[PDB]
Amino acid sequence: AISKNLPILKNHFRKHWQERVKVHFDQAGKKVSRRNARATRAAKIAPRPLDLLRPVVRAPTVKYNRKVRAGRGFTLAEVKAAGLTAAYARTIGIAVDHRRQNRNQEIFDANVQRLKEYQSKIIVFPRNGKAPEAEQVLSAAATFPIAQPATDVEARAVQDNGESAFRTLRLARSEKKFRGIREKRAREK
């Protein structure tokens, strides 16, 4: 059962696995179904763009916080700063998320600009029903794409103050490690 110089393998097939095998024979069929469903939904919703406008947010975690992506919806504060109510925003094609909060001025200002540009690029048909026939744009994300914010200029002058970056990192670790013991010794005295 164990022979030769081979890696240790862990193949989890000791249950009735053959009863739960899923082969995606309908991969091509489902692609046709999704394309048909998108086409019939676009014809149903008039010239509406088939998707709602989304804000730009910072991804969490230290690993992914260097990038911005699309969030669920604009906050109540962002909607209010744009000059309209949340209820009217939902009926006009804007996603609203009540549980997200604003703590960064850069993110808040950018989402305010997105709402203002969106309002100036759409036409809202009156409730009377005359309904002038306008061409349908199938995507709002492509019309309003998300770009990573600029960080630094291409070239700049060298400014060295004589300090050491390695020394700065080492001292930062040391201060955090011994903060508790230093306070106790100071308090006991």
Partner 1 sequence: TWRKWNVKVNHNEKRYATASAIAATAVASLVLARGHRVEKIPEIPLVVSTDLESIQKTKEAVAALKAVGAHSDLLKVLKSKKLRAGKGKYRNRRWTQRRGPLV
Partner 2 sequence: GNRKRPVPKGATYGKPTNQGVNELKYQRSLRATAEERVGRRAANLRVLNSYWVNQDSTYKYFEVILVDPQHKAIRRDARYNWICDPVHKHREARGLTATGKKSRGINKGHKFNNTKAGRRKTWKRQNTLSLWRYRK
Q: How many residues sit in the footprint of partner 2 (CB under 8 A)? A: 9
Under rule CB under 8 A, residue 9 binds partner 1: no
What does residue 17 show for φ and ψ, rounded to 5 degrees?
-75, -30
CA dihedral in degrees (108, 110, 116, 119; nearest 10)? -100
Nearer to partner 2, 4 or 20 (CB): 20
Q: Which does 124 bind (CB under 5 to 8 A by kind): partner 1, RNA, partner 2, none?
A: none
Q: Cα(59)–Cα(104) distance, rounded to whole angstroms?
A: 13
Under rule CB under 8 A, residue 9 binds partner 2: no
Nearer to RNA, 25 or 120 (CB): 25
Q: How far is the CB of 21 from partner 1 (least distance, A)?
A: 5
In the chain, the largest separation of any two C-alpha atoms, in whole Å, equals 84
Under rule CB under 8 A, residue 21 binds partner 2: yes
Under rule CB under 7 A, residue 49 binds RNA: no
Q: Which does 82 bind (CB under 5 to 8 A by kind): RNA, partner 1, partner 2, none?
A: none
The answer to whether 62 and 150 are in contact (CB under 8 A) is no
* 139, two tokens: 């995507």
Q: Which stretch binds RNA (CB under 7 A): 97-105, 114-122, 153-161?
A: 97-105
Neighbour count for residue 146 (Cβ, 10 Å): 16
Under rule CB under 8 A, residue 2 binds partner 1: no
Q: Which stretch binds RNA (CB under 7 A): 80-88, 113-121, 154-162?
A: 80-88
| Residues of this chain, 10-29, that bind partner 1 according to CB under 8 A | 21, 23, 25
Nearer to partner 1, 12 or 44 (CB): 12
* 32, two tokens: 């046709």
Size of the chain, expressed as the number of residues it contains: 189
* 44, two tokens: 């149903």
Q: Cα(97)–Cα(54) distance, rounded to whole angstroms?
A: 10
The answer to whether 58 and 107 are in contact (CB under 8 A) is yes
Nearer to partner 1, 21 or 158 (CB): 21
User: What does the binding site for partner 2 look like in residue numbers (CB under 8 A)?
Assistant: 15, 17, 20-25, 27
